[PDB]
Amino acid sequence: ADLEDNWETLNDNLKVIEKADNAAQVKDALTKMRAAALDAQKATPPKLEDKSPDSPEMWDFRHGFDHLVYHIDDALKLANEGKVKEAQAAAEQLKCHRNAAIQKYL
Ligand SMILES: [V+3]
């Protein structure tokens, strides 16, 4: 449930999606990404541990993962229409959201 472990999980599943041939392979990888994003959202960084939940610092941290989840869910909508190619392009765009949610807290 480490933040770094959740980042690894997200990158593992993005690779699976880029290699995928069918929408079910993509769907399963996106499902795992959503779980990893929600687990990451719980992994408050040591430097923010003492911050109030209502603090702007924690608002930013939490909501980076909310945003990643929103678009994982949009990519799921595509995988659930058998649109393998469209869901793969949506997945590629998740890298930017992943970076925005996690990179500055590593
Ligand atoms: V958005």
Side-chain angles (χ1 to χ4, degrees), residues 1-7 9-14 16-17 20-31 33-41 43-53 55-84 86-94 96-106:
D2 200 301
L3 192 64
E4 230 299 341
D5 298 324
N6 276 315
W7 164 276
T9 300
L10 295 160
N11 299 327
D12 288 353
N13 282 293
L14 282 170
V16 170
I17 289 169
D21 282 315
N22 63 70
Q25 297 168 310
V26 174
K27 185 233 173 48
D28 167 73
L30 286 175
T31 301
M33 284 182 79
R34 195 191 198 269
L38 288 174
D39 200 72
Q41 184 182 52
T44 314
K47 295 182 165 59
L48 297 184
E49 278 174 13
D50 304 332
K51 231 76 176 182
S52 149
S55 61
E57 291 79 22
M58 288 303 302
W59 188 103
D60 195 1
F61 179 78
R62 267 188 11 260
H63 273 70
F65 297 96
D66 293 326
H67 193 200
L68 182 57
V69 167
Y70 180 102
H71 288 294
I72 284 163
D73 280 348
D74 246 352
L76 272 164
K77 198 182 169 331
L78 297 173
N80 288 322
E81 293 228 346
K83 302 181 180 169
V84 191
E86 305 197 17
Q88 285 174 313
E92 170 76 15
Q93 296 186 55
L94 293 179
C96 191
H97 305 306
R98 172 208 57 198
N99 295 346
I102 292 170
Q103 160 265 302
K104 71 186 131 162
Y105 305 109
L106 287 177

mmCIF file of all heavy atoms in Angstrom, residues 24 27 65 73:
data_model
loop_
_atom_site.group_PDB
_atom_site.id
_atom_site.type_symbol
_atom_site.label_atom_id
_atom_site.label_comp_id
_atom_site.label_asym_id
_atom_site.label_seq_id
_atom_site.Cartn_x
_atom_site.Cartn_y
_atom_site.Cartn_z
ATOM 1 N N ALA A 24 -10.994 -7.032 -22.846
ATOM 2 C CA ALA A 24 -11.049 -7.651 -21.530
ATOM 3 C C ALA A 24 -9.687 -7.598 -20.839
ATOM 4 O O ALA A 24 -9.609 -7.448 -19.614
ATOM 5 C CB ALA A 24 -11.532 -9.093 -21.660
ATOM 6 N N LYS A 27 -9.663 -4.060 -19.668
ATOM 7 C CA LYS A 27 -10.588 -3.859 -18.560
ATOM 8 C C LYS A 27 -9.994 -4.329 -17.241
ATOM 9 O O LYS A 27 -10.125 -3.658 -16.211
ATOM 10 C CB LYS A 27 -11.895 -4.598 -18.834
ATOM 11 C CG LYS A 27 -12.929 -4.335 -17.794
ATOM 12 C CD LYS A 27 -13.466 -5.628 -17.228
ATOM 13 C CE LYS A 27 -14.391 -5.361 -16.051
ATOM 14 N NZ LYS A 27 -15.377 -4.290 -16.381
ATOM 15 N N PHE A 65 -5.678 12.068 -6.828
ATOM 16 C CA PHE A 65 -6.113 10.698 -7.050
ATOM 17 C C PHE A 65 -7.560 10.626 -7.489
ATOM 18 O O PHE A 65 -7.901 9.753 -8.292
ATOM 19 C CB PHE A 65 -5.881 9.882 -5.792
ATOM 20 C CG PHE A 65 -4.420 9.800 -5.459
ATOM 21 C CD1 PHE A 65 -3.857 10.667 -4.547
ATOM 22 C CD2 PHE A 65 -3.597 8.943 -6.172
ATOM 23 C CE1 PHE A 65 -2.496 10.649 -4.298
ATOM 24 C CE2 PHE A 65 -2.241 8.917 -5.942
ATOM 25 C CZ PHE A 65 -1.685 9.786 -4.996
ATOM 26 N N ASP A 73 -12.045 5.573 -14.738
ATOM 27 C CA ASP A 73 -13.437 5.197 -14.929
ATOM 28 C C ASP A 73 -13.918 5.524 -16.338
ATOM 29 O O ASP A 73 -14.642 4.730 -16.949
ATOM 30 C CB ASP A 73 -14.288 5.904 -13.882
ATOM 31 C CG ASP A 73 -14.248 5.221 -12.529
ATOM 32 O OD1 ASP A 73 -13.743 4.080 -12.460
ATOM 33 O OD2 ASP A 73 -14.736 5.837 -11.543
#
